[PDB]
């Protein structure tokens, strides 16, 4: 096939309003407004075009591991070492709290205005009803702490990665495990869904990525190198699924080629670890945060 | 008016100091996730004790990468679990994310150790102090300090202390050791080294 070739991108905007390290970020469905979370107990909603802070929310607990943006744009969420999921209304008032987990909250994703899916470090996931504020289902297959999750485009399934070198697929309606994949040697840090919804990618501490196809039930590609001896903190796909972007602990992000599986680019502009990484809904820009307290937008 | 509030909160942020509290169940670290706040000489310290999680710490420990110091409490009167505490300290010291963080080591329960001595490790036979209680105290301290000095000489330092149950000077010690840590940082930051 025709290789992608060198992929050169440069920082367009830089967002500087956070005091501590960035731990998570998420984009809005409008492809303009994004929410980011910092360990200094602040939740800022930015404007990429102008870099103006639309909002700023002080959180009760300083250590937040994740944040989410409602697909309708009327709410947000976040959580961490407090073992709660806090949901804020954007009429900003704390509208609710979801408290059923036992370990720290690792990830969360809105299904609707009324439902949200969460994972915790107690090795379980759960589906909530926001109006009633109680769990509806639990998913209890994993053996190690769940680190990431990713909702399917139809919103009827999802995959989760755990600190056991394995992944699993769940039926939201049925609440039963469908499959299991074991290709890695150490903890899984990130997981993503391919645009078509029939695959996913995974980054681990053994310093490799791998691509799993649900129908074949086996790892297809293995994105590694002989000189990379660090783990992977985040992954993300592009609009077409042709470039896989992965952040590392070497302070740089690499732009892999999902099919040819040979690195095609690098984004070296952060002085510390690259923690979070997201791609816009309409595929126009890429945002990356780091432990340097700065957010950068690349095009 | 977001910018003014953010500037004020940034000014507030660097004024206070964070701490992480570590230890075992038998170590009376609670009397030395909960939040504690105290003040010495008009400087504010915030100490955090994490107890709502499972017994695997290799992932949520990374949240405390940029803390000022770590407080490690040891129950020194129990010979059985002393090797477990040594292994815990060795794991903490050599972590990649805690390589720049200084450790304040508290060797608690000194009265119990004295009582036990007056009533595991074979190298204690050919040991001499740098009277039995003094030898045991410094033997355990040096057991920890061998691990401390075996690596990471330039980057960070370990401050040892002997603590009893009725001690009331722990806050002063944390204040002084944090002052020294900050002096090291300023030394490296103002072109002096």
């Amino acid at each position: 096939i025709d290789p992608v070739g060198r992929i050169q991108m440069r920082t367009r905007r830089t967002l500087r309003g956070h005091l501590a390290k960035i731990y998570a970020m998420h984009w809005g469905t409008d492809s303009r407004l994004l929410v980011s979370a910092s360990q200094d107990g602040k939740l800022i909603i930015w404007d990429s075009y102008t870099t103006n802070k639309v909002h700023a929310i002080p959180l009760r607990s300083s250590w937040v591991m994740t944040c989410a943006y409602a697909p309708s744009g009327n709410y947000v969420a976040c959580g961490g070492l407090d073992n709660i999921c806090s949901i804020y209304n954007l009429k900003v008032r704390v509208s609710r709290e979801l408290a059923g987990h036992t370990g720290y909250l690792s990830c969360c994703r809105f299904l609707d205005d009324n439902q949200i899916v969460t994972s915790s470090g107690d090795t379980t996931c759960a589906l909530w009803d926001i109006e009633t504020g109680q769990q509806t289902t639990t998913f209890t297959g994993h053996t190690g702490d769940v680190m990431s999750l990713s909702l399917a485009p139809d919103t009827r399934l999802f995959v989760s990665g755990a600190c056991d070198a394995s992944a699993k697929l769940w039926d939201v309606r049925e609440g039963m495990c469908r499959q299991t994949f074991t290709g890695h040697e150490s903890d899984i840090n990130a997981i993503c869904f391919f645009p078509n919804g029939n695959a996913f990618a995974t980054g681990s501490d053994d310093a490799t990525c791998r691509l799993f196809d649900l129908r074949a039930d086996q790892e297809l590609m293995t994105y590694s190198h002989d000189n990379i001896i660090c783990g992977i903190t985040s992954v993300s796909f592009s609009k077409s699924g042709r470039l896989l972007l992965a952040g590392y602990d070497d302070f740089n992000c690499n732009v892999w080629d999902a099919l040819k599986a040979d690195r095609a680019g690098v984004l070296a502009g952060h002085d510390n670890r690259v923690s979070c990484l997201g791609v816009t809904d309409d595929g126009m820009a890429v945002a990356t945060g780091s432990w340097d307290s700065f957010l950068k937008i690349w095009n | 008016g977001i910018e003014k509030q953010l500037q004020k909160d940034k000014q507030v942020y660097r004024a206070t100091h964070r701490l992480l509290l570590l230890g075992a169940d038998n170590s009376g670290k609670s009397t030395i996730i909960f939040e504690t706040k105290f003040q010495v000489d008009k400087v504010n310290f915030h100490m955090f004790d994490v107890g709502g999680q499972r017994d695997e710490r290799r992932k949520w420990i990374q949240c405390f990468n940029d803390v000022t110091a770590i407080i490690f409490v040891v129950d020194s009167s129990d010979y059985n679990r002393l090797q477990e505490a040594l292994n815990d300290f060795k794991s903490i010291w050599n972590n990649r994310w805690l390589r720049t963080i200084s450790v304040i080591l508290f060797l608690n329960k000194q009265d119990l150790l004295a009582e036990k001595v007056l009533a595991y490790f074979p190298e204690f036979a050919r040991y001499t102090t740098p009277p039995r209680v003094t030898r045991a105290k410094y033997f355990i301290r040096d057991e920890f300090l061998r691990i401390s000095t075996a690596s990471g000489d330039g980057r960070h330092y370990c401050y040892p202390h002997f603590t009893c149950a009725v001690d009331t000077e722990n806050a002063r010690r944390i204040f002084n050791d944090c002052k020294d840590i900050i002096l090291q940082m300023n030394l490296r930051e103002y072109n002096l080294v």
């Epitope: 053996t143 600190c163 056991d164 070198a165 001896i229 | 017994d55 695997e56 477990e84 972590n95």
Partner: nanobody, 115 residues
């Protein structure tokens, strides 16, 4: 899919599903009615070796990367050594936290040793 299978007095560990040489190995026992206790470790290349004081001078450890196996040459045992012995592999390569954990995912099923 990692898997550590032990056998065995000279104990031998069989490792599968990963590179053997880039990791630091350990020896973890579990005496009856007590928690898991660390015994011996050996670095990647087999240079640095450390022991619990109890088995100092008695148990000899050596790793064989070529055959991908770990040994604990033990002699002059005591009744206090009766326990289950597990083979542990702390997770990160090129570098050891949760080995003696209640539910650690990277250690074998173990072999019961009775003296």
């Amino acid at each position: 899919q990692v898997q550590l299978q032990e056998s065995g007095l000279r104990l031998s560990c069989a490792a599968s599903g990963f590179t053997f040489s880039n990791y630091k190995m350990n020896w973890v026992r579990q005496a009856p009615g007590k928690g898991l206790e660390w015994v011996s470790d050996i670095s990647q290349s087999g240079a640095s070796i450390s022991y619990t004081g109890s088995v100092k001078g008695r148990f000899t450890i050596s790793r064989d990367n070529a055959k991908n196996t770990l040994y604990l040459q033990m002699n002059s045992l005591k009744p206090e050594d009766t326990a289950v012995y597990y083979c542990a592999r702390c997770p990160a390569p090129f570098t050891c936290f949760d080995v003696t954990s209640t539910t650690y995912a990277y250690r074998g099923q173990g072999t019961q040793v009775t003296v």
